[PDB]
Amino acid sequence: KQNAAAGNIKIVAYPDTNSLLVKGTAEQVHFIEMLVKALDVAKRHVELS
C-alpha cells in the first residue's frame, strides 16, 4: 500500500546477468528504478604520460 514502510525493500545482486532483483511495492520499485538510473553512468577514460 501507498503507506508501506521504506524499510521493507529488499535488493539482491545477480552478477550472472549483471542485473538486480528488487522486492517491494509498486511505488517503491519505481523510486528504486529512478535512483538506479540516477546512479550508473559510463565513466570517462584518462591517459597519463
Binding site: 552478477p15 550472472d16 546477468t17 549483471n18 559510463a42 565513466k43 577514460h45
Partner: protein, 102 residues
C-alpha cells in the same frame, strides 16, 4: 671497435570467454641459442612467459568493457654469463599492468 644491433619481437595471444565469466590464459616457453660444436660453449637458453586474466561486459552501446590483469616478460638469467653470445636472445623487460578499459 664499432658495432650495430637491431631487434624486433611481436607476440599475440587469443582467448575465448563468455560475458560476465572470468577467464585466464597462461603460457611459458623456452628457446635455445644454437651456437654449435663439440668444442662448444654450453647451449644457452632464454624463457618467456605471459599471464592474462580478464572479465568482459557488454554495454548496450555496442561496447565491450574488460577488467584486465596482464603480466609479461622473460626470466632473469645471470647464468647466461657468456660473452661469445653477443647474438643473445633479445632481452625484453618484465611488466605488470592492471586496469579497466572500454
Amino acid at each position: 671497435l664499432e658495432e650495430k644491433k637491431q631487434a624486433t619481437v611481436v607476440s599475440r595471444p587469443v582467448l575465448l570467454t563468455q560475458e560476465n565469466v572470468p577467464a585466464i590464459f597462461d603460457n611459458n616457453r623456452t628457446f635455445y641459442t644454437k651456437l654449435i660444436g663439440e668444442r662448444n660453449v654450453a647451449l644457452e637458453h632464454v624463457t618467456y612467459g605471459t599471464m592474462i586474466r580478464v572479465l568482459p561486459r557488454f554495454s548496450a552501446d555496442g561496447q565491450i568493457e574488460m577488467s584486465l590483469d596482464i603480466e609479461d616478460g622473460n626470466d632473469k638469467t645471470p647464468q647466461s654469463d657468456t660473452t661469445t653470445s653477443v647474438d643473445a636472445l633479445p632481452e625484453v623487460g618484465r611488466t605488470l599492468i592492471s586496469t579497466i578499459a572500454r
